[PDB]
Amino acid sequence: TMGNSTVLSFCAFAVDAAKAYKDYLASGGQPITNCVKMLCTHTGTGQAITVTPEANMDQESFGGASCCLYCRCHIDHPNPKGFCDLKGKYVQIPTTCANDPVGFTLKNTVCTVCGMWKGYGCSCD
Ligand SMILES: [Zn+2]
Ligand SMILES: [Zn+2]
């Protein structure tokens, strides 16, 4: 098992950190841990990213920044204003994927319409 600081270091100095984290996971690597899990009722909306925790019965809630590879790596966000969609918000992850929230937020996309994760509850189809 690799620990957090070895993975994080490895990705942070990659020219493409997101590709390194994915390629690492694909090879069977141990996911980044110590994301900040939230106590909450699990009666929330199920929206992906929210101002307070919004988990439904099928989700967990985390502190957004602790689930963001770039925040966890202390590097610039790949958005040309450098702005973070998770910093200071709360992210709702499906409980099945809650063992790798950093990987989940990376690999996935919020539906422009729903508000929920495309492919994971987004009902729109
Ligand atoms: Zn971030
Ligand atoms: Zn949708």
Side-chain angles (χ1 to χ4, degrees), residues 1-80 82-117 119-124:
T1 283
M2 324 295 322
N4 295 330
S5 280
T6 300
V7 184
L8 285 172
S9 178
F10 186 82
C11 295
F13 295 103
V15 286
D16 185 352
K19 189 182 184 278
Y21 189 43
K22 296 176 191 172
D23 281 350
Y24 165 74
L25 292 173
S27 80
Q30 281 300 331
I32 295 146
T33 53
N34 290 31
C35 310
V36 181
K37 192 203 215 243
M38 293 292 120
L39 186 57
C40 59
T41 54
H42 294 74
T43 65
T45 64
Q47 302 263 278
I49 315 188
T50 48
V51 176
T52 57
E54 283 305 322
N56 65 28
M57 71 158 150
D58 293 311
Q59 290 162 335
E60 309 292 355
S61 275
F62 296 81
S66 82
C67 306
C68 167
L69 173 73
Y70 312 99
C71 289
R72 288 288 298 276
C73 282
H74 305 307
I75 64 188
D76 298 338
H77 287 58
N79 153 86
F83 145 90
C84 195
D85 284 323
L86 297 158
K87 203 173 168 192
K89 294 197 168 318
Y90 298 90
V91 70
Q92 274 63 246
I93 310 312
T95 325
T96 58
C97 313
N99 66 306
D100 179 31
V102 169
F104 190 91
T105 54
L106 202 70
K107 287 150 145 195
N108 276 297
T109 305
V110 175
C111 162
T112 88
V113 192
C114 269
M116 308 178 74
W117 289 110
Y120 282 97
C122 165
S123 44
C124 319

